[PDB]
Amino acid sequence: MKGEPKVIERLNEALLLELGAVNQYWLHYRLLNDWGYTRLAKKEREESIEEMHHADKLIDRIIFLEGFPNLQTVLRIGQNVKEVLEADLKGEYDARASYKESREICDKLGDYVSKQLFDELLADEEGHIDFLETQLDLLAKIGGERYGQLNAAPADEA
Amino acid sequence: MKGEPKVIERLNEALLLELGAVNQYWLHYRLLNDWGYTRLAKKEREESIEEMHHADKLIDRIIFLEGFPNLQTVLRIGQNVKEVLEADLKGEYDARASYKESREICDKLGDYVSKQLFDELLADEEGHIDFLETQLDLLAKIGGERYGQLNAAPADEA
Amino acid sequence: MKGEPKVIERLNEALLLELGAVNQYWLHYRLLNDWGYTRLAKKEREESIEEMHHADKLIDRIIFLEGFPNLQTVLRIGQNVKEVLEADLKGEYDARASYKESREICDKLGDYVSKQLFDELLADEEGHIDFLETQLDLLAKIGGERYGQLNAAPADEA
Amino acid sequence: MKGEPKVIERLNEALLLELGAVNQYWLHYRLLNDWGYTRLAKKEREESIEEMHHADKLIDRIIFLEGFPNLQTVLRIGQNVKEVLEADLKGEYDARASYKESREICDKLGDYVSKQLFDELLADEEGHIDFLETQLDLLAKIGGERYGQLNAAPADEA
Amino acid sequence: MKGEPKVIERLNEALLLELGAVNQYWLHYRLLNDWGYTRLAKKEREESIEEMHHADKLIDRIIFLEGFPNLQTVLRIGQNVKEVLEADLKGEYDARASYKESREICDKLGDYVSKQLFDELLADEEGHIDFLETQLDLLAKIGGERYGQLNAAPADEA
Amino acid sequence: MKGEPKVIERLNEALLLELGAVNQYWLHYRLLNDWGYTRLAKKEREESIEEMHHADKLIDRIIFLEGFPNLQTVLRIGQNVKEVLEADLKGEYDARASYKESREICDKLGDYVSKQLFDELLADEEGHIDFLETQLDLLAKIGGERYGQLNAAPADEA
Amino acid sequence: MKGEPKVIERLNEALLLELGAVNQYWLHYRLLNDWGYTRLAKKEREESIEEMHHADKLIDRIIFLEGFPNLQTVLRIGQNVKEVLEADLKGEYDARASYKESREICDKLGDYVSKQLFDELLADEEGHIDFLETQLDLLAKIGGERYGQLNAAPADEA
Ligand code: HEM
Ligand code: HEM
Ligand code: HEM
Ligand SMILES: [Cl-]
Ligand SMILES: [Cl-]
Ligand SMILES: [Cl-]
Ligand SMILES: [Cl-]
Ligand SMILES: [Cl-]
Ligand SMILES: [Cl-]
Ligand SMILES: [Cl-]
Ligand SMILES: [Cl-]
Ligand SMILES: [Cl-]
Ligand SMILES: [Cl-]
Ligand SMILES: [Cl-]
Ligand SMILES: [Cl-]
Ligand SMILES: [Cl-]
Ligand SMILES: [Cl-]
Ligand SMILES: [Cl-]
Ligand SMILES: [Mg+2]
Ligand SMILES: [Mg+2]
Ligand SMILES: [Mg+2]
Ligand SMILES: [Mg+2]
Ligand SMILES: [Mg+2]
Ligand SMILES: [Mg+2]
Ligand SMILES: [Mg+2]
Ligand SMILES: [Mg+2]
Ligand SMILES: [Mg+2]
């Protein structure tokens, strides 16, 4: 199905955001692991792998529409566990805004199946945002050192 | 262990090559799948996931040496199955050359464990090269259409 | 829920297309089987049975809306395996266009659950189109005789 | 049982042929594998291991007869799959002729158990010849590229 | 294989370091257990047993080279959990430096298998260093009392 | 329980003897293994590990009594299997004498639980002495070469 | 990867040594079995099969480097069990020396993966040497007739 160039453009913008999130979550996984926060690190790895699946779905849709997926292009880091979470959350807010605009563009152009892809991604993103906002609320309430302790394993495990 | 800046630089050059290979193999997986070469597509996916593990090991070593992993940066595509294989092979030859030079640099600077990482990557790469050269030899001998047929599934499978 | 006559009309147009696809895929199953392409034949049977389920869902929705399902009414055939695939693909493009227009009509009339039915059918159809386009691309690349061979079983199986 | 020198000589001629066949089949296994004909390669490996068992039986008989097994001594190669098969077949015809003459010599000298060893080897050899002649007939009938394709695995297997 | 006296000397220096580490880790296990840090204590026991295996491998290599293993000779203690970890880390840095120099000496003298032993020990040591540095980083970030709590069991377990 | 300095001194003398026995038995294990007496070697390894457990119990008791365990300090070797056994036996006789004197000192000072530890060690030691005396008696009766043969494995095992 | 001619030459020298060891160990297996030393015979068979795997790895590397493996070319025998072991040991010392020189040549020419192959073979060889030296030490200590008895089975087994 030869797709609308503007739809392919929006799918490629999403792909760039998702690839950036893959890399950011993976770097956060390895950073948190080195700091000793091995339980939060495992969650960050899982979040990276979820974004990998999103990137795969975007690539598949772009190829179906006979467009060219742009992976050649792809970061917010952080010096403590609060900054890492905040950086992830900023990324998710940015992706959410992109997908909201993209579903509107696909709807107006009549590509309702691409619209549906963006609707699914948007729902996913609000789930991720809910999770991260809750973690940052917990960190605020119990303090960063107890949040870190809660998200670390004893020495005989990891 | 605060690492030599030149060693961290070589690890980051490897990371850029590996991230590029992840993306190239994944794009090839989805492209080959859309063309109907679903068996070769599955191998390309597996090759991408192997390069993901290499990238992970490089990131881990960079962080141990107290360097900054550069993922912000990352392609050869192809219009038929021979060109896809050739593009993968060119990438592997380029990576091999990088790792050979890197093991020599780590050896001269006395970072023998980073040397060992590059030695492992080099052995891996020559394995990958052996595989791809064999596939291209088979394609040469039986022709591209029979090679494609061999690497496609019937309609009731995939 | 007494439905809009225009919505029931669009559901009946979909039912006619789906019943036509059931019959076409089933005839293709038996034709391909007689020609010896028993693996593609099995896929065509499966595609017919998928369209039977779609027809069932349309009938159920029409009856819920207190309309009369029109089954009394229901073809593109083909002389070789490429023509069979092309005929299936033309049918799918026609159905896709019908469902796109139907979801728009249901949306404008405020029957959002019927809209959702058409959205699901539209997504299904684009999946079917993706599959058939890939098979026709493979046939183009490896040639029709190798595509047929790939989709045939040896004599000791079927 | 102190054996006839002429019988020990014939057993040593067989051992030299068998050791040569071990080496030739093993080299063919690795060559075919590198060319991508991994299914025929596996058969060549199995044929090499069968010849290893024959060599073992010859060594055992020579030692029983209080002779000295000569292994210090041991090739036809090939540039394509037809030449490889032809080289194996020429070797088998040569071995068959040796074993026929050897059974006659053992019979005339009254070493009926060594005669029996050569009779078994001769029957084995005619089995091997039957197999190889059939493969070369198939290659002749379907052509070398289809024979190679039939004897190659897709990329996601080997 | 009668070994180079200088190689045997370096193997004996490693053995003395490893035996010292066995004793230090075991004393730390019992000390930490008495203080109530039973989870970190279990890790220290495991680390002692890993060093016992290293000592065994060194003794085996010395005997193969027809040298005399010197076990007759063998400590940093600590008053709190941070000091215990720091003492272990200082020991590991000292061992790493010894093994780096030893691999260079074996390489220059042409004892490449002893070189390989030291290369393995060096890689092990950098793993141990990575672990201990991470534990000390965690302790720094969450504080010593939370690190101790994390590494202690409730009264109904240990 | 703050212990008597004289009791802690006797526990530390026992620890020094036990650590010496660990090292001696382990060296004997590796020596006997290299000579080919692999069955006696396995027993010597087991004896070393038993002495490791004794050392652990001594360290635990010293720490309970708020003393400082001295591991910083720790040999009789042997050129044939009789000398190895004799060296082990001399060590056991020395340890037995130490533990006998130590139980008497603990009894007189009123540390009856430390007395009990030495009583257990003394009973253990007389068991070890019984075993070693029996092995040396067997060696005397059947001769050293048959004793060695009995305590060696064939080449296809170890 | 088109290899250095000097590297291919060293790989072929190793192949000739390994093929010679295969044959020597196999002949020793059958000889020892006929003499009644069936347990040592089984070990010699296992050693032959280990050398077969080494030869296979060498052939694979030569073909990858686009060289020609030379198998056309390939012995120390022995009249008693001590001479058989001594002949095996002389072969291993010769192979070790070859592999040491070969790893140095590959290193200087920059073929680090072939260097690694020779490093692995060298470590293997020193293991084999350790085993054989231990067997010859045992034979020296208990005498040849007891060593033979230890390595023979009773009549109701083999
Ligand atoms: C184009 C970009 C990428 C795509 C499309 C992608 C896709 C995937 C997919 C589909 C999986 C399978 C997950 C599952 O089975 O549930 C996966 C796993 C994984 N990914 Fe990625 N990935 C990408 C980039 C990366 C990067 C940059 C890394 C950095 C290390 C990475 C590391 C991993 C690892 C370690 C696994 C697990 C593999 C295993 O369990 O054996 N990936 N990826
Ligand atoms: C402070 C001195 C030592 C102490 C307290 C100690 C303690 C122990 C203990 C409690 C065990 C566990 C045994 C079991 O699970 O039944 C053990 C095992 C072992 N020990 Fe020691 N040990 C010491 C020194 C040594 C030395 C010098 C060596 C020389 C190699 C050694 C080699 C081993 C080995 C190989 C094991 C077996 C580990 C395994 O099975 O994974 N130990 N030791
Ligand atoms: C005197 C010459 C040789 C003799 C007598 C011999 C004998 C044997 C025998 C009896 C087996 C066991 C097969 C089975 O268990 O069914 C075997 C296996 C094998 N042979 Fe040979 N062989 C010889 C030469 C070679 C050569 C030149 C190669 C080249 C690579 C080779 C490679 C192998 C391999 C890889 C195996 C399989 C071992 C395993 O599965 O672990 N052999 N050989
Ligand atoms: Cl932090
Ligand atoms: Cl606090
Ligand atoms: Cl193609
Ligand atoms: Cl053709
Ligand atoms: Cl047709
Ligand atoms: Cl054709
Ligand atoms: Cl060919
Ligand atoms: Cl053709
Ligand atoms: Cl064909
Ligand atoms: Cl503390
Ligand atoms: Cl606090
Ligand atoms: Cl002895
Ligand atoms: Cl005697
Ligand atoms: Cl003998
Ligand atoms: Cl005697
Ligand atoms: Mg709308
Ligand atoms: Mg998500
Ligand atoms: Mg790889
Ligand atoms: Mg459908
Ligand atoms: Mg045969
Ligand atoms: Mg070097
Ligand atoms: Mg270690
Ligand atoms: Mg004891
Ligand atoms: Mg070996």
3-class SS string, chain C: CCCCHHHHHHHHHHHHHHHHHHHHHHHHHHHHHHHCCHHHHHHHHHHHHHHHHHHHHHHHHHHHCCCCCCCCCCCCCCCCHHHHHHHHHHHHHHHHHHHHHHHHHHHHHCCHHHHHHHHHHHHHHHHHHHHHHHHHHHHHHHCHHHHHHHCCCCCCCC
G129 lies within 8 A of chain F by CB: no
Other C-beta atoms within 10 Å of B119: how many? 21
Of A154, A33, A14, the residue nearest A98 (C-alpha): A14
Where does ligand 3 bind, in terms of residues with CB under 6 Å?
Answer: D 19, 22-23, 26, 49, 52-53, 55-56, 71; G 19, 22-23, 26, 49, 52-53, 55-56
Angle between helices G112-142 and F5-35 (to 10 degrees): 90
Amino acid at E74: V
3-state secondary structure of F143: coil
Other C-beta atoms within 10 Å of B114: how many? 27
Q: Tokens in use for F34?
A: 């290299």
What gap in Å lies between CA B109 and CA B115, rounded to an integer? 10
CB contact (8 A) between residue B40 and residue D154:
yes
**Chain B with chain G: Cβ pairs closer than 8 A:** 14
What gap in Å lies between CA B122 and CA B116, rounded to an integer? 10
CB contact (8 A) between residue E141 and residue A34:
no
CB contact (8 A) between residue B151 and residue D154:
yes
CA–centroid distance, F11 to ligand 13, in Å, is: 26
Nearest CA residue ID for atom 3, ligand 3: D52
Q: Which residues of A touch B72 (CB under 8 A)?
A: 23, 74-75
Angle formed at CA A83 by CA A78 and CA A88, multiple of 5 degrees: 90
B128 is in an annotated binding site: yes
Contact E69, E63 (CB under 8 A): yes
What gap in Å lies between CA E38 and CA E34, rounded to an integer? 8
Contact E12, E62 (CB under 8 A): yes
Other C-beta atoms within 10 Å of D93: how many? 12
Who's near G77: CB < 8 A, 6+ residues apart?
A: G24, G27, G31, G83, G84, G87
What gap in Å lies between CA G48 and CA G29, rounded to an integer? 8
Contact E25, E48 (CB under 8 A): yes
What gap in Å lies between CA F127 and CA B152, rounded to an integer? 72
Chain A partners (3+ C-beta pairs within 8 A)? B, C, E
What gap in Å lies between CA D33 and CA D35, rounded to an integer? 5
Q: Per the structure, how many domains does chain C have?
A: 1
Contact E71, F20 (CB under 8 A): no
Nearest CA residue ID for atom 18, ligand 2: F49
Where does ligand 1 bind, in terms of residues with CB under 6 Å?
Answer: A 19, 22-23, 26, 49, 52-53, 55-56, 71; B 19, 22-23, 26, 49, 52-53, 55-56
What gap in Å lies between CA G145 and CA C134, rounded to an integer? 76
Dihedral sign, CA of C25, C27, C33, C35?
A: negative
- Tokens 């010699």: give the residue: G44
Query: Which residue segment(s) compose the domain that G93 sits in?
Result: 1-158
Q: Tokens in use for D69?
A: 């097994």
Contact E60, E104 (CB under 8 A): no
A63 lies within 8 A of chain C by CB: no
Structure-determination technique:
X-ray
CA–centroid distance, A145 to ligand 5, in Å, is: 7
DSSP F108: H
3-state secondary structure of A82: helix
Contact D89, D31 (CB under 8 A): no
**Chain A with chain C: Cβ pairs closer than 8 A:** 14
What gap in Å lies between CA G111 and CA G132, rounded to an integer? 32
Chain G partners (3+ C-beta pairs within 8 A)? B, D, E, F
Contact G48, G107 (CB under 8 A): no
Query: With DSSP H G I counted as helix, E B as strand and the rest as coil, what are the percentages for chain B, rounded to 5?
Result: 80, 0, 20
Dihedral sign, CA of A13, A15, A21, A27?
A: negative
CB contact (8 A) between residue B134 and residue D34:
yes
Q: Which residues of E touch B1 (CB under 8 A)?
A: 126, 129
CB contact (8 A) between residue F74 and residue E74:
yes
DSSP string computed for A2-65: ---HHHHHHHHHHHHHHHHHHHHHHHHHHHHHHHT-HHHHHHHHHHHHHHHHHHHHHHHHHHHT
CA–centroid distance, G103 to ligand 25, in Å, is: 28
Nearest CA residue ID for atom 28, ligand 1: B52
Q: Which residues of G touch B130 (CB under 8 A)?
A: 64
Closest ligand 2 atom, residue E55 Cα: 30
What gap in Å lies between CA B126 and CA C146, rounded to an integer? 34
Report resolution in angstroms. Answer: 1.5
CA–centroid distance, C47 to ligand 22, in Å, is: 7
